[model samples]
Target chain A: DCSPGIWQLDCTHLEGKVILVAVHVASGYIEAEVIPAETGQETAYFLLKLAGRWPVKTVHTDNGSNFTSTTVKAACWWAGIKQEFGMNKELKKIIGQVRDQAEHLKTAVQMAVFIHNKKRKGGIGGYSAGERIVDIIATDIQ
Target chain B: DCSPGIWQLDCTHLEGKVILVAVHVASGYIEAEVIPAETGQETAYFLLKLAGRWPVKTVHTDNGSNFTSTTVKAACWWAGIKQEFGMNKELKKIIGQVRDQAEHLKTAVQMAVFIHNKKRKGGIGGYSAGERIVDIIATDIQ
Candidate 1:
């Protein structure tokens, strides 16, 4: 399946902001925003704004209280964004590693995300996340 | 199938400038840039920047002169974003409609693109492109 559009949503605490990320699975593209605090409402808002610009479908994450709340659920229902669980544990670990080095947490992790997307992945026959997206979707379908 | 990360890149001449667009298929997420003229170099740069942030694998467009140039092909090969020909004719038609009303072609088409994405399409279960994205990608898979 062409899965770069599928996203994994999560949040982490930094010095003055909560880093909420929507990670594009197929291409490892990341849409990240810094919010004042971690709340279902904020999470929902970030996700909504994200969906406004990016393609977000079939979101996966841990069933944290913030994610499973009525606020988030209703928001997703209104926006038509789906919610799910039990995926991206590896991403969660990756996020944590960046968190440890994140002085300007948002900007730091953001740059890190860019770097991550650029680096070639071992899978997809040595293609980067960006390259793999093309491999999966566009090809010699002529 | 996940197709959001796959994008189609193209250019259309408007009143004052050349409008370069990268349209994501999965979620209808779009990125548009306005340039003075169309050049393979500029096209490659925009797509490269887009791939830097978003997930992009396969890219398709009409074989315009700028698109077929070595400047772009080498760029795509280096970035790992594959370029293709002959797909999404409707996208061209839709883009033209946006242009017809586009006095400020770039800004006008940009807004119109939003409206287009929000308008429900019969193809994806009568949901808007935005909604269909959420509908197909977001769901209970547990």
Candidate 2:
């Protein structure tokens, strides 16, 4: 989903901790986690990284007042990106799954992300999400 | 991506525990994690949850060795859903992001997801992904 337009971003709790994820709509490529990456400065850091790797144009979110300020939007917007807020109800659904993976958070989620990418459904949808991008991009070429 | 045809499943490690996440392509709703949830029976337990919520038809993954087995697939198949293995690459990218948010894992990432969903363009678009499903469903409705 990380093509050029749609903005997909979400932050959830992992055993009382924070885990952030950004999705690329077209490619299914994701960039996630980190402290304070929730604001214009922090989030833009990730978004810049995302932009470094992909063509980002828009961001999607809800008006929570807890995160993303004009700073966040200004950060992404200058780069031709936009942040839109809405009901965003689904992001809350996955919070329950992270609780049990407590303590060894670092490696725990690293491994979790590895598989997430592996299983993500992009254009071709492959086994190793790391590997699937090639299939999808290769297809994009043809 | 939430077209109601694929089940994108991914497994990861957290606190030395297995965390599994499955996304309903049609809904973008994710169900994730556990010591075993990242794998076989544990994963299916959540998959069963997904079954109750969404009509899953296909599963996305990597291969025979990494994870997911007859145990998981069989559990889901009875629901008339089939698991498909593919190369998914995006998960690794997130792991790097997660590592930086390491000590800040729980809080940082928690806030991060809050912000992500806050911004995500879900089922919408390429600018449309967050809005993609909306358009898709709207079309279906039309």
Candidate 3:
């Protein structure tokens, strides 16, 4: 069976908002959200929103209660996604740099995700994350 | 000269606030603040407040722009504190659990830090982090 891909989720605060970021490991494509609170419901809702756009298999996150809560668990169970724990520093670095570029946290995160997805990486053979995601999806279909 | 102590700083989001947390390594005591934004100025200010209360030697943090910014560096330099990079996940767990217990992020972080400081650890000869901090301070004075 072909695996969809693993996603990593982590959050931080910026401009009085909880900025949730999910990184697609293979493509490095990022999806971000600015939420009012750091709750399981919000995180689950974020997951569901992304579910509509991408193919998510396993989610890796820090062992925060919100990630381990029943609400998140049910959401994942319903979607057939597996849950794991931990995080990385890339998203944090991106957030730090972009938070200053925009007036609102929501705008900052959206633009940050946009920049990250368009930026070419050496690890992915100089293809942009957005390009890589398109290639992966193309391969999946054929 | 005696080493004052090493402190680790990290942050998270809760209830539309930037909750910064610093942990005393030897004592394991925690100091937390509800900041309006994730900026070097705010983190530097948080560090300065703790500087007044404790004998800080080294401060550890992530390599995020806020942590590595000129403002934070200047603050640490003025106070004769060394700046290092990286963080741990203890505070994340605390934030996740305590976020639900309080209506406000400030109150949640305060209670979480309080509970953590009062919690006895097996590593510190069965003493609480608060007690351990007091012991260290007493030793420094003597």
Candidate 4:
């Protein structure tokens, strides 16, 4: 039930921008937003509104300034959700390994998720989220 | 059955040596060796021994001095195995793709084999030479 923001900052392309990635930990659902500047309060408010409709139990993020701000902390406290950080270190580590082998980690992650969803059956006797959402929806619905 | 010396070489470090590589067309079994120099008669004798033992219907190699030699051509005519050179262009292209996405391919292959062998039953169901031999012997003895 934890909602986590996986953010990546690249100075190669843009000078002062960060990519804000919101992910539902339990369901592996993801949403991405690009912020022009590092505004802790504004980012926190965005996350707060996202969690408002999702019934998020906890807010997890890295030790970035936007996530570790007083505004984000206070908002989570008021929303009845505990704020946690660094839960994504292991995921980042795995992504690093994938990137070491492949040129891009994003492509590797997408491919891994595709395979995981297609071939693996979940605990609830259902296909993976990717397979259920991508394959089923694409093939059956259309 | 003809007896052949199947020499396994470690090419992790080598120089000034002509490397001979043979691949099975159907099973993808690969055998390679490094010689001191490109001697047509020596290379022909080595290839003949390999062809005599294995069910080698066709031999594919690069157009090198040792490979396109008179001795090698004569040996192939005597052994009744067809000489196929320059057939590695397609394989080279595919292997390039394999190198690019090696991690994904390796992970996918491992996961696929794991699922296949885990649920497999009876003697004919298992996969790979090592897995089949070990499992079959263990089941028969136990």
Q: What is the DockQ of each candidate?
A: 0.10, 0.03, 0.01, 0.01
Candidate order by lDDT, decreasing, is 3, 1, 2, 4
The models' CA-based lDDT, in order, is 0.58, 0.45, 0.63, 0.39
lDDT of 1: 0.58
What order do you get sorting by TM-score, best first? 1, 3, 2, 4
Error of 3 at B31 (Å): 0.4
Segments of candidate 2 deviating more than 4 angstroms:
A1-5, A36-38, A64-68, A84-103, A120-142, B1-142
Better of 1 and 4 by lDDT: 1
Candidates arranged by DockQ, highest first: 1, 2, 3, 4
Instruction: Give chain A TM for each model in order.
Output: 0.66, 0.62, 0.80, 0.48
Q: For residues B27-107, write the lDDT of model 3, one tens digit per residue.
A: 677777677879987776666545534556777766456567876776676556776621226656775787775455554
Q: Can you list the residue pairs that collide in candidate 4?
A: none
Q: What interface RMSD, in Å and to 1 decimal, does model 1 have? A: 7.7
Pick by lDDT: 1 or 3, better one = 3
Per-residue CA lDDT of candidate 4, range B1-142, in tens?
Answer: 1111122211211234444445433322333344465677656655554442332445554444445677667656655556552112332334344334223332222222222222334466434322332222223221
CAPRI-style docking class of model 2 based on DockQ: incorrect
Ten residues in sequence with the least summed lDDT for candidate 3 chain A: A133-142
Q: What are the per-residue Cα lDDT tens digits for candidate 3 across A3-64? A: 43677788877667677878766666676767788988777766754443345667887655
lDDT of model 4 at position A67:
56
